[PDB]
Amino acid sequence: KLSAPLDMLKQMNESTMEQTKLDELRKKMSLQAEILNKAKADNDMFFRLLIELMSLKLQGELFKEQLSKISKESGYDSAQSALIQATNSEGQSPLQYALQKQDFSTAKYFLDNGAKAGPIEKAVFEIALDSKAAKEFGFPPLPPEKEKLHPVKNFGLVLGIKTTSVDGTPSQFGHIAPTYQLMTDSVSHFAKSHPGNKNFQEIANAFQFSNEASAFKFSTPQRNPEAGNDLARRIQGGELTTIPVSCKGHAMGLSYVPDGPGSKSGYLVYTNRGLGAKSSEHGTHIFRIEDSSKITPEFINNMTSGHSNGASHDEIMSQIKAAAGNKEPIHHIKQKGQKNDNCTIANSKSNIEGILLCQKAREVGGFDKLTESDMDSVKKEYKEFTKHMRVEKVNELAKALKENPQDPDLNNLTKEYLKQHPNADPKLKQTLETALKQASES
């Protein structure tokens, strides 16, 4: 019956390349482009035409003909030339784009036309494999081996290290379940080492509640209807509640901060530092919620299952705006842009700075009444948290590297950290350099 899925997996594996090989291929085709000395290709035009083409939902053969025309119209010799070289402003190749959108028919046509699967394409594919669209295409469930967080992602996502494991696994894209668990542990560990910090007792309690009630497996919540009933009830009772939120191939940040226990008003804190947000809006947005009853079980079920149910960014975003009465946010926290990552750590963690802001606003009686020193206090506690999380992960990395001094991944993670964070606290650098020295010991 479903041999198309088997065929696509075969193709994806035949077309696999290491990143450096794929970069060579691309660079060599750039040299050939310069020999011909024809006009420069227009990637933005290609993707515009590509996205229009995909929405027509054409059958394979017509699709492939149209794909040839728009490649040429965009300045490429062929569909294959465009497929191997074009990237959009998010840095996605066409194949990455089709997989991120869970458009497996288009992804397979791209493969038929010679598109290559580097480590990033394969990671985005594995994420897209855990979705209703993947099941309906005939794919099986992911093997349970892939449930564990790869060490290159555990350290890579927390510490911000871009690298690839020796086995091909990039540090960038992660499933929701193990990354939400890692956030829940990081927040809880901080809360426990700082019992006088009342804010973080609330935050740890909220993550623990949502982490358990959502019961993600890979990137699909496992008790969809009930979980949203639980979270909505917690919000209705006026308790700080986090809301795991995703769309196709992307995770955002979302939480509800109550005015007080049993209150009906509070704030909805939304974070997106990456795909789908304009660079000017990268960061965290705080909406005033006058009546929490608009944060319904259905809304929350839609938020948590956004990726598995194939919701688009605009569908999720519009529901978030609806729950806030389509009013504009009252505050924006600008936060560093991210690209080529589904932000399972980035958006969840940066959302906490918005939670802390709202906790301060609550206690001084409103956003009206925040002073400059209040908001510098907020930023100071947020940075105290992210410092704690960073220091523990560097110590964990040094420890791991000394107990397995010959592992290529631990060594390369350690080296790449120092290379990519030159301005790192000297105590962090010291800890990792001494670990690297120790490792070179046979």
Residue numbers in the entry: 19 to 460
Sentences reproduced from the published study:
A Legionella effector LegA15, also known as AnkD, is one of 11 ankyrin repeat–containing effectors in L. pneumophila. The Dot/Icm effector LegA15, a 471–amino acid protein encoded by gene lpg2456 of L. pneumophila Philadelphia, harbors an ankyrin repeat (ANK) domain that is known to mediate protein-protein interactions in eukaryotic cells. LegA15 is a GTPase with a unique catalytic mechanism, unlike any eukaryotic small GTPases. Here, we show that an ankyrin repeat containing effector LegA15 localizes directly in host lipid droplets (LDs), leading to Golgi apparatus fragmentation of the host cells by hijacking the host vesicular transport factor p115.
We next solved a binary structure of LegA15 bound with an unhydrolyzable GTP analog 5′-guanylyl imidodiphosphate (GDPNP) at a resolution of 2.27 Å. GDPNP was well defined by its electron density. GDPNP is shown to bind a positive-charged pocket formed by Arg291, Arg408, and Lys367 without inducing a large conformational change of LegA15 because LegA15 in this complex is well aligned to its ligand-free form [root mean square deviation (RMSD) of 1.0 Å]. GDPNP also makes additional interactions with LegA15. The guanosine hydrogen bonds with residues of Gln353, Lys354, Ser368, and Tyr400 in addition to Lys367. The γ-phosphate of GTP is anchored by Ala364 and Gln356 via hydrogen bonds, while its β-phosphate hydrogen bonds with both Arg291, Gln356, and Lys367. The α-phosphate hydrogen bonds with Lys367. In addition, highly conserved residues Cys361 and Thr362 possibly interact with the γ-phosphate of GDPNP through an intermediate water, which is in a good position for a nucleophilic attack. Consistently, we observed that the C361S mutation retained the GTP binding but abolished the GTPase activity.
